[PDB]
Design a protein around this ligand. Structure first.
Ligand SMILES: [Cl-]
Ligand SMILES: [Cl-]
Ligand SMILES: [Cl-]
Ligand SMILES: [Cl-]
Ligand SMILES: [Cl-]
Ligand SMILES: [Cl-]
Ligand SMILES: [Cl-]
Ligand SMILES: [Mg+2]
Ligand SMILES: [Mg+2]
Ligand SMILES: [Mg+2]
Ligand SMILES: [Mg+2]
Ligand SMILES: [Mg+2]
Ligand SMILES: [Mg+2]
Ligand SMILES: [Mg+2]
Ligand SMILES: [Mg+2]
Ligand SMILES: [Mg+2]
Ligand SMILES: [Mg+2]
Ligand SMILES: [Mg+2]
Ligand SMILES: [Mg+2]
Ligand SMILES: [Mg+2]
Ligand SMILES: [Mg+2]
Ligand code: NA
Ligand code: NA
Ligand code: NA
Ligand code: NA
Ligand code: NA
Ligand code: NA
Ligand code: NA
Ligand code: NA
Ligand code: NA
Ligand code: NA
Ligand code: NA
Ligand code: NA
Ligand code: NA
Ligand code: NA
Ligand code: NA
Ligand SMILES: [Sr+2]
Ligand SMILES: [Sr+2]
Ligand SMILES: [Sr+2]
Ligand SMILES: [Sr+2]
Ligand SMILES: [Sr+2]
Ligand SMILES: [Sr+2]
Ligand SMILES: [Sr+2]
Ligand SMILES: [Sr+2]
Ligand SMILES: [Sr+2]
Ligand SMILES: [Sr+2]
Ligand SMILES: [Sr+2]
Ligand SMILES: [Sr+2]
Ligand SMILES: [Sr+2]
Ligand SMILES: [Sr+2]
Lengths: 150, 142, 49, 142
RNA sequence: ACCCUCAGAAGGGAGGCGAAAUAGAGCAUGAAAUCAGUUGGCGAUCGAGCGACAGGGCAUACAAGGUCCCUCGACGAAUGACCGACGCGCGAGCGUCCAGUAAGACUCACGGGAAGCCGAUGUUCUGUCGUACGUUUUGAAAAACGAGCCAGGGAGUGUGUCU
RNA sequence: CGCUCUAAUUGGAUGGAAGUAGGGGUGAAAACUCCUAUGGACCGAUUAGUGACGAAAAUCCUGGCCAUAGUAGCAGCGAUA
RNA sequence: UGUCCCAACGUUGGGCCCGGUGAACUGUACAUUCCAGUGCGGAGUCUGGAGACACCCAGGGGGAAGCGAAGACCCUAUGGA
């Protein structure tokens, strides 16, 4: 697994991590990218709106075949990865929780750092025609989050 | 609309190719040039053969495109572009500091460059950019 | 006999594969193959005196 | 309060005029990189030099632009070949006894990296007292 | 261990041990391919063997390199004048003298200057040259053959006899 | 020039060896060397030997990995649930 | 008698958008191309011009002498059956 890739001052910072989550790594990059810089509370409201289908997540890199979305700003393609979003909600829940336990105002802290990393693949096999089988794997994702006082 | 040209050239009764060649040279040397009275510039030869050539350029083309100008305005500028490495930085800079005009939008009168003048009293086989344009189908707006 | 204890055979042309002896889908015997024989190894018969 | 290097750090060797001239030539002329052909085109191909052997090799055939091919003609002047840029001739040192026989006016010493701090400290104070510069000195806060 | 979080013997946070947890379980070290985040350079009007050599922009903690720039002067190879005077040519122009002079690459000395400043490194721009590599072939950029990428593996060896 | 192990001669290392990463110097070059970080236990030089000694390539071998792609499939069958 | 003149409208399952799951083929490199030319005479990459602001969605497949298979034809081998 990963280690925080950025330095953090414990006196004004709170951390959290997800480990080996079996979810789209591609969706995770998109989501991290979008919520970085937001406040914990804003990220949460944003992600809940994504799961509800009212706010799309811009897909700027892993966008092949993706339909355009009018609400996407400065870009065209977007989607509503609800699964990876719920995983990020757990992460934020943990982050804000730690934040408060330390005396900070969790919800109000800025998402200073958030990145997803592919830590591996849960391997699977899928039978195919002509007597052969091909890969059918699950991505394994770790994600780091650092909250910081305004 | 306003072009601080260091040089204003008068193409009236002047051999297009010879003026073009000098305007390119100056443009490459940093001069801002305005060619005036382009419709009165001239090209020697038999009108019928000259027109056949410019009409061929008009008819050439396809999806990728071969947009050839019909106005004396553009004919002349294209002529100049072919004497400049317009796809290189310096070449595009030179080409972009050169403008051609129908008539004379300035208050000064352009100067006649040496060696580019055509003596109408000694020549009958030549045509006018304006005449070529009209034949090409351009809308005589000059 | 190191690396030679295998009935590995090459499939020849036809399956878009190099003509390398294989057994159970594994390349074997030849020197360029992992687990294959040593091409010109140390030999006991050599006179070292 | 600040870092200082031990020994005769600023010392310069004394060279004949001809050696200073040739040392200056070597430094002015330099040489090509001499990296293997196409090392930049494929990660699996390192920069370490290899004679291009392809029958059709562009570099082998000496085509201008494909890089120079190693030839004796590129050798540096014998009188200066191998000298540190300072002008000193280097002497590899592993212990204090290696300092014996070294001319601090013509040679500078280089302590092998393997040597530890304890042995380096002794080597460094003994070299300074012998008038020998140490190319890779220890920096202490003084 | 204890505590917090969580649906939770999961995971996370804080904490404890140890010289080291970036030694926390296929748990010494931890390359490349490659992925995330990010720094420098370039970037939505512009062209393709991706570079080599020159020269500019921007970028650079220390250490392991310390040079570099401008006035002037000294030296000064090949080469080599302007101007002026005189004389020729229809003319473009040339001859003789000034003169193998002034100039002339490198190098050096005096005086002044630079420390991102000189080298170097990263990237980019300009100039010149440039259609991979290996093989097959009279002829390969080839619309001839090989390779997705990287690491590791991968081909003149032994006995006898002869020369 | 470089690699393995042997021998003689002779050195380095917990006051930090090998390796790795980034960087400085030398050599026409093979390649040598130093600095910093990591690492935490081994490492050289010279000389005479030794050889399962050097890779860009063989539809080469094995392992790992990227683009392909969040794409094809998860509809079609007289059993539409 | 929609085989045809000559095609139209409709039905069901796909196709398209969304959640989840999630492969393979293929990949020397570079690659926005077009017209001509040149070249081992069948060029996105050479030359000259022309055109060309970046990215994305859907499509039918013109080109990559497309991908797949060391041509089964033909010949050659002091080859096999
Ligand atoms: Cl993925
Ligand atoms: Cl057209
Ligand atoms: Cl151009
Ligand atoms: Cl006439
Ligand atoms: Cl030599
Ligand atoms: Cl000199
Ligand atoms: Cl041999
Ligand atoms: Mg789509
Ligand atoms: Mg079956
Ligand atoms: Mg074996
Ligand atoms: Mg390389
Ligand atoms: Mg480990
Ligand atoms: Mg080879
Ligand atoms: Mg042939
Ligand atoms: Mg010895
Ligand atoms: Mg190897
Ligand atoms: Mg596709
Ligand atoms: Mg039914
Ligand atoms: Mg065949
Ligand atoms: Mg037959
Ligand atoms: Mg037979
Ligand atoms: Na993208
Ligand atoms: Na939009
Ligand atoms: Na929008
Ligand atoms: Na003419
Ligand atoms: Na046209
Ligand atoms: Na066996
Ligand atoms: Na024996
Ligand atoms: Na530069
Ligand atoms: Na061949
Ligand atoms: Na070739
Ligand atoms: Na060809
Ligand atoms: Na593949
Ligand atoms: Na293959
Ligand atoms: Na019908
Ligand atoms: Na097609
Ligand atoms: Sr994309
Ligand atoms: Sr001229
Ligand atoms: Sr066959
Ligand atoms: Sr050391
Ligand atoms: Sr801890
Ligand atoms: Sr002289
Ligand atoms: Sr390899
Ligand atoms: Sr790394
Ligand atoms: Sr070998
Ligand atoms: Sr994949
Ligand atoms: Sr169904
Ligand atoms: Sr079916
Ligand atoms: Sr071109
Ligand atoms: Sr289609």
């Amino acid at each position: 697994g990963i280690s925080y890739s950025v330095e953090a001052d414990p006196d004004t910072t709170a951390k959290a991590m997800l480990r080996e989550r079996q979810m789209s790594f591609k969706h995770s990059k998109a989501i991290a990218r979008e919520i970085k810089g937001k406040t914990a509370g804003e990220a949460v409201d944003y992600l809940e709106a994504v799961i509800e289908g009212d706010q799309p997540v811009p897909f700027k890199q892993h966008n092949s075949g993706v339909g355009h979305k009018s609400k996407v700003d400065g870009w065209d393609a977007g989607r509503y990865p609800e699964k990876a979003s719920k995983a990020f909600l757990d992460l934020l829940e943990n982050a804000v929780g730690n934040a408060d336990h330390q005396g900070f105002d969790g919800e109000a802290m800025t998402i200073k750092h958030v990145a997803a990393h592919k830590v591996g693949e849960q391997q699977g096999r899928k039978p195919r025609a002509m007597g052969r089988a091909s890969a059918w794997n699950s991505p394994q994702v770790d994600v780091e989050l650092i909250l910081e006082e305004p | 609309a306003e072009f601080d040209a260091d040089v204003i050239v008068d193409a009236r009764d002047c051999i297009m190719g010879r003026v073009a060649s000098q305007v390119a040279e100056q443009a490459l040397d940093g001069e801002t040039v305005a060619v005036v009275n382009a419709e009165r510039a001239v090209i020697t030869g038999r009108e019928e053969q000259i027109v056949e050539k410019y009409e061929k350029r008009v008819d050439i083309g396809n999806d990728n495109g071969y947009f050839y100008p019909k106005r004396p305005d553009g004919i002349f500028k294209r002529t100049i572009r072919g004497m400049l490495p317009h796809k290189k930085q310096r070449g595009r800079e030179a080409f972009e500091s050169v403008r051609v005009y129908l008539g004379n939008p300035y208050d000064e009168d352009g100067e006649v460059l040496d060696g580019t003048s055509l003596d109408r009293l000694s020549n009958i086989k030549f045509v006018t950019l304006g005449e070529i344009s009209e034949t090409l189908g351009a809308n005589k707006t000059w | 006999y190191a690396g030679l204890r295998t009935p590995a055979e090459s499939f020849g042309s036809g399956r878009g594969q190099a003509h390398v002896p294989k057994l159970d889908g594994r390349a074997r015997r030849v020197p360029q193959a992992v687990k294959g024989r040593s091409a010109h190894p140390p030999k006991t018969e050599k006179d070292r005196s | 309060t600040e870092l200082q290097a031990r020994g005769l750090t600023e010392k310069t060797p004394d060279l004949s005029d001809e050696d200073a001239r040739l040392l200056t030539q070597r430094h002015r002329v330099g040489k090509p990189q001499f990296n293997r052909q196409d090392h930049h085109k494929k990660k699996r191909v390192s920069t370490s030099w290899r004679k291009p052997r392809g029958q059709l090799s562009k570099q082998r055939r000496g085509i201008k632009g494909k890089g120079d091919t190693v030839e004796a003609g590129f050798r540096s002047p014998t009188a200066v070949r191998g000298k540190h840029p300072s002008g000193f001739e280097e002497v590899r040192v592993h212990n204090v006894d290696d300092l014996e026989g070294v001319d601090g006016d013509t040679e500078a010493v280089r302590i092998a990296s393997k040597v530890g701090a304890r042995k380096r400290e002794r080597i460094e104070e003994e070299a300074e007292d012998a008038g020998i510069r140490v190319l890779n000195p220890t920096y202490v806060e003084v």
